[PDB]
Design an enzyme around this catalytic site. Structure first.
Site, short mmCIF file in Angstrom:
data_model
loop_
_atom_site.label_atom_id
_atom_site.label_comp_id
_atom_site.label_asym_id
_atom_site.label_seq_id
_atom_site.Cartn_x
_atom_site.Cartn_y
_atom_site.Cartn_z
N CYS A 154 -4.27 2.94 -2.88
CA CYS A 154 -3.28 3.05 -1.80
C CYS A 154 -3.65 4.12 -0.78
CB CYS A 154 -1.89 3.32 -2.36
SG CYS A 154 -1.14 1.90 -3.17
N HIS A 214 0.80 -1.20 0.00
CA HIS A 214 0.00 0.00 0.00
C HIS A 214 0.85 1.27 0.00
CE1 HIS A 214 0.97 -0.90 4.17
NE2 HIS A 214 0.76 0.37 4.46
#
Ligand code: NA
Lengths: 116, 113
Positions: A37, A25
């Site tokens: 993200c 992420h």
């Protein structure tokens, strides 16, 4: 195949959420990934910040932005009931958020539950 | 992308509503990352109330001209639903407040009381 972002939520046999491990992420450029993200990071960081502010303790944390990002948040054992209950409430909301991201942006994020 | 968020608190401190403007895509382009963060907080708040508290909040959404979202809690909530709603709502506010610090050039969060 495996998605860039991976999210595993650990549940005890009684349903209590014990930990979340999120990878992939970290901030990484274009056409779709950046916004997913950001959404994952927002949920994860607000989860931690809400525990600290409202539940009034610091969870066990391991973090690294390096190989695409790593976050592990683990709930201390033997928390007093009010801290347990608030944590669970936020943890369920965090899981829901990730589950819904994995439903709607399924090529970017996978969310799974494992048992303790 | 000037995002403005206004949260309403009652006299005893209970959160009653949030109004957010400016968070619509686009874009595309740095700003959409901030918009996606704001939208994630708002939508997870709403979904959390519906799933865990068991009622629908009052919601007005308009995608046009920068976007508009207003979410309000029903006035006569039974006590089980009221308390849970407040924890979610405080978390929603904390997220927006922290976004307004981290992205202070793009997001402003205020409270009306
Ligand atoms: Na337990």
């Amino acid at each position: 195949s495996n998605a860039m972002i991976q999210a595993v939520f650990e549940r005890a046999e009684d349903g209590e959420l014990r930990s979340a491990e999120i990878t992939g992420h970290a901030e990484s450029g274009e056409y779709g990934l950046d916004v997913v993200c950001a959404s994952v990071s927002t949920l994860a960081i607000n989860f931690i910040n809400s525990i600290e502010k409202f539940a009034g303790y610091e969870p066990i944390l391991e973090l690294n932005e390096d190989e695409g990002g790593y976050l592990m948040v683990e709930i201390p054992k033997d928390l007093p009931s009010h801290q347990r209950e608030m944590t669970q409430l936020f943890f369920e909301s965090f899981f829901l958020g990730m589950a819904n991201l994995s439903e709607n942006y399924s090529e970017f994020v996978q969310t799974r539950v494992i048992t303790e």
